[PDB]
Enzyme design. Structure first.
Site, PDB file in Angstrom:
ATOM      1  N   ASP A 106      -3.533   0.722   2.646  1.00  0.00           N
ATOM      2  CA  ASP A 106      -4.720  -0.530   2.848  1.00  0.00           C
ATOM      3  C   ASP A 106      -4.224  -1.888   2.702  1.00  0.00           C
ATOM      4  OD1 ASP A 106      -6.084   1.917   3.034  1.00  0.00           O
ATOM      5  OD2 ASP A 106      -6.788   2.034   0.887  1.00  0.00           O
ATOM      6  N   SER A 107      -3.166  -2.108   3.345  1.00  0.00           N
ATOM      7  CA  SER A 107      -2.657  -3.471   3.169  1.00  0.00           C
ATOM      8  C   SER A 107      -2.359  -3.862   4.904  1.00  0.00           C
ATOM      9  CB  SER A 107      -1.466  -3.797   2.262  1.00  0.00           C
ATOM     10  OG  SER A 107      -0.952  -4.934   2.287  1.00  0.00           O
TER      11      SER A 107
END
Ligand SMILES: [Zn+2]
Ligand SMILES: [Zn+2]
Lengths: 99, 171, 103, 119, 104, 66, 119, 60
Positions: free
Chosen positions: H35-36
């Site tokens: 989730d980056s």
């Protein structure tokens, strides 16, 4: 006193390309030049001095960046010019910059 | 000196592609930018009530909000309108009916129903006392007044506003 | 003393001057003061709208004209696209969408 | 993004280091594929595809939800007309070595947001 | 001649049912008083048919747009109940069939 | 707010095209033909002009003086 | 109660005696007509359906397209008995199509008795 | 670059909040992993999502 804060003006001036087709190979990096301020051997000075003393919304453009060197000029000076700010009556922008 | 366009096109070597950006597509549209605008005395009364009578007869060529629509024509302007129930479909006149004229009568006199009911008459298209629907013009205008009526009175300045919105039923 | 010889309504706050003129008109039951207020307000409104257009006169006028013509040319583009919705075979049998149709 | 994909900037690579298409279009934001399959934000993929259509077509795509005039196949058909892969994939080249990446990468305009949560 | 010319002007635009005659007009009325005198001075009318199929009720240089919006729930048989005979002749002209309210 | 000077993705100067863009739209070029006529090929440059919202025209409605 | 519901509705569609915000609910199974006029009732507009045609016809669309130029407005759609504010308790008793071309067309009928349609 | 029609009336195209960016969904160097996102530094240098933060201090 444009509607854009100074960092925004400065940022936009940064992105204006300059016609350094030759002089870039002459100039030193300022980090390497031995002089206490900017000098014409490690920089090109620019001035912008515009005030909107008329009702029509003055567009400040790269056409208003006046170089101290006729060879390092904003590309659109040598088509339309890059818009740096739109000014209302009585707003002004005076600054000098070095490339 | 002679210069035909068919000769002008032959001066060039090659100048004369696709336009597929323009294609009409129902799941795609266009865009929208920032505009600036978006979403006392009697001698005066006589002339004021006498000017509209004069200046409405002048030449008109413009519309108030956007002078881009050209006019075509002009329609110049007591009364007693017998309202009708849309379900019963009351046919007071011979226009809702098939014929253009009264097949059972000749004079649809608005004879009064009685002596104590001037507005609540009994309008019916019955020249005889029989063989017509008894359309009792009940006094519904007393609680259903109004609406102004006018006509093409030969292009004359008049009015025939309604007195009340009287409504009749099948009595 | 300063406001005596120097007029205010042409200031940038012309909307406030119009509000003050409206308040003076409403406060007065005399028709003479109401008509003088109406005249002053109409004059100041015209002056301010003229100045607004003059400052709107360039570039602002151009983007107003483009937005106003863009919405109409978009309505023309939509109606032509609508008649282009009459074309057949503009949808695919590989179920790229589905819709209920029960009973 | 508008589809509940959220994430901190994990690193910043200059344009020289980002991967690039045939033309020198490097991404602005590279998000990991693993954001998608558990979350099924396929609206995100369809946004990216139709955004790439919109940017070439040169007008703003419609993403009103229940509009059966729009579907993925219709967008892919349009996208293929501009000379791109109909599913939005592209051959990217590794910015470091310049080698083509063996997997073609799904790349296209998507509307990102920057949230008040700065570090 | 026999065409629907029904209009439903509002209270502030109540035109006089009779032509303007100097022997039937009198001064009784005076921002507060500005709307009062307007009732009996500006309000005989004319309606202009535009090319776009709309119309406007003018009352002079003013222009109020109107639609002939339908009123089938009150399709009253508008007639000249001029009070002759019993209860008036109620001459059958045009059935009132609309609710046209003027607006700017 | 104002038009970005450079297309963020690639680098092409787009800050001298906005008034031209709008003038071409006022010639009633279709919205992608304006971009084709300015010389924006990559969709990364095209989304600079298509997406740009020129809010500075609204900010200039507010008066500092006059 | 078959006359009251049609008359109270007609009057809403005429904006005269009953203001648009009033909601008349007809509970059939239990013989109850409940009319609410008070404040705080959340409602939403719905296109009216009659027989199976909409009341919203090309006339209204054309008039409303030239709006401002003719000073037509949404209030004229309300005051023409074309759209109606329905509220969650009256929504109990509407039969609500979801678009005309989907739900009122002569498929093998689902109900064919839609009273209202989603806008 | 893609909108609902509804966000016309929200007036989102006048006061928008975001930038259409050329996103790529690739694993690349792995610094985008859980989730980056990897951003383009040169885009940031050009003003990509650059913002200003105003804090007002009031004292009487
Ligand atoms: Zn030096
Ligand atoms: Zn670019």
């Amino acid at each position: 006193s444009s509607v854009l804060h100074d960092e925004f003006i400065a940022h936009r001036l940064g992105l204006i390309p300059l016609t350094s087709d030759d002089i870039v190979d002459k100039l030193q990096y300022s980090r390497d030049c031995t002089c206490e301020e900017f000098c014409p051997e490690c920089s090109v000075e620019f001035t912008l001095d515009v005030r909107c003393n008329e009702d029509q919304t003055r567009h400040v453009t790269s056409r208003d960046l006046i170089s101290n060197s006729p060879r390092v000029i904003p590309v659109t000076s040598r088509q339309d010019d890059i818009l740096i700010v739109k000014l209302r009556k009585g707003q002004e922008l005076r600054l000098r910059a070095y490339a | 000196v002679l210069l035909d366009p068919a000769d002008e096109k032959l001066l060039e070597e090659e100048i004369q592609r696709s336009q597929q950006h323009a294609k009409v597509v129902p799941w795609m549209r266009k865009t929208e930018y920032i505009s600036t605008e978006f979403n006392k005395d009697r001698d005066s009364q006589i002339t004021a009530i006498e000017k509209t009578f004069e200046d409405a007869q002048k030449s008109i060529s413009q519309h108030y909000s956007k002078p881009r629509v050209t006019p075509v024509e002009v329609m110049p302007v007591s009364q007693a309108m017998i309202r009708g129930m849309m379900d019963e479909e009351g046919n007071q006149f011979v226009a809702y009916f098939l014929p253009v004229e009264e097949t059972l009568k000749k004079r649809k006199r608005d004879q009064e129903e009685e002596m104590d009911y001037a507005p609540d008459d009994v309008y019916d298209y019955k020249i005889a006392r029989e063989y017509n629907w008894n359309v009792k013009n009940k006094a519904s205008k007393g609680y259903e007044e109004n609406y102004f009526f006018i006509f093409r009175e030969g292009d004359g300045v008049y009015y025939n506003e309604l007195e009340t919105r009287v409504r009749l039923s099948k009595r | 003393e300063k406001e005596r010889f120097r007029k205010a309504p042409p200031n940038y706050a012309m909307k406030k001057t119009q509000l003050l003129k409206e308040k003076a008109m409403a406060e007065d039951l005399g028709d003479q003061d109401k008509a003088k207020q109406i005249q002053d307000q109409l004059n100041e409104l015209e002056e301010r709208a003229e100045a607004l257009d003059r400052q709107r006169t360039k570039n602002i006028s151009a983007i107003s004209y483009i937005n106003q013509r863009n919405r109409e040319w978009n309505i023309v583009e939509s109606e032509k696209a609508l008649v282009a919705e009459s074309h057949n075979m503009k949808n695919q049998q590989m179920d790229p969408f589905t819709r209920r149709q029960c009973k | 993004s508008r589809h509940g994909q959220k994430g901190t900037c994990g690193i910043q690579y200059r344009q020289e280091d980002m991967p690039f298409t045939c033309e020198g279009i490097t991404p602005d934001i590279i998000i990991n594929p693993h954001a998608i399959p558990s979350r099924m934000t396929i609206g995100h993929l369809i946004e990216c595809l139709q955004g790439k259509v919109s940017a070439n077509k040169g007008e703003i795509g419609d993403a009103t939800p229940f509009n059966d005039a729009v579907n993925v196949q219709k967008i892919s058909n349009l996208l293929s007309d501009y000379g791109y892969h109909l599913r939005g994939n592209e051959v990217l080249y590794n910015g470091f070595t310049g080698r083509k990446i063996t997997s073609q990468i799904f790349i296209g305009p998507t509307y990102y947001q920057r949230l008040k949560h700065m570090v | 001649g026999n065409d629907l010319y029904f209009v439903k002007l509002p209270n502030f635009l109540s035109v006089e049912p009779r032509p303007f005659d100097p022997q039937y007009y009198e001064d009784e009325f005076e921002e507060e008083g500005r709307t009062r005198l307007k009732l009996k001075v500006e309000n005989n009318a004319r309606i202009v048919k535009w090319s776009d199929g709309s119309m406007s009720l003018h009352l002079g240089n003013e222009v109020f747009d109107v639609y002939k919006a339908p009123l089938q729930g009150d399709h009253n048989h508008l007639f000249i109940r001029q009070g002759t005979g019993l209860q008036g002749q109620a001459v059958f002209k045009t059935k009132l069939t609309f609710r046209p309210h003027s607006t700017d | 707010m104002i038009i970005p000077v450079r297309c963020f993705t690639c680098g092409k100067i787009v800050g001298n095209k906005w008034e031209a863009y709008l003038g071409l739209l006022q010639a009633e070029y279709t919205e992608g033909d304006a971009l084709d006529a300015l010389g924006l090929k990559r969709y990364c440059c095209r989304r600079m002009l298509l997406a740009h919202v020129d809010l500075i025209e609204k900010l200039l409605n507010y008066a500092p003086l006059e | 109660p078959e006359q009251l519901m049609n008359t109270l509705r007609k009057l809403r569609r005429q904006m005269d005696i009953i203001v648009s915000e009033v909601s008349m609910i007809r509970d059939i199974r239990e013989r109850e007509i409940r009319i609410y006029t008070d404040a705080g009732r959340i409602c939403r507009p719905l296109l009216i359906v009659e027989k199976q045609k909409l009341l919203l016809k090309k006339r209204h669309i054309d008039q409303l397209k030239e709006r401002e130029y003719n000073n037509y407005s949404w209030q004229d759609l309300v005051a023409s008995g074309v759209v109606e504010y329905i509220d969650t308790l009256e929504e109990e008793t509407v039969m609500l199509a979801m678009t005309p071309d989907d739900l009122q067309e002569k498929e093998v009928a689902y109900c064919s008795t839609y009273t209202h349609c989603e806008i | 670059l893609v909108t609902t029609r509804s966000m016309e009336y929200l007036r989102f195209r006048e006061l928008p909040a975001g930038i259409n960016s050329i996103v790529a969904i690739a694993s690349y160097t792995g610094y985008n992993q859980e989730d980056s996102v990897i951003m383009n530094r040169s885009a940031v240098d050009r003003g990509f999502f650059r913002s200003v933060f105003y804090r007002s201090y009031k004292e009487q």
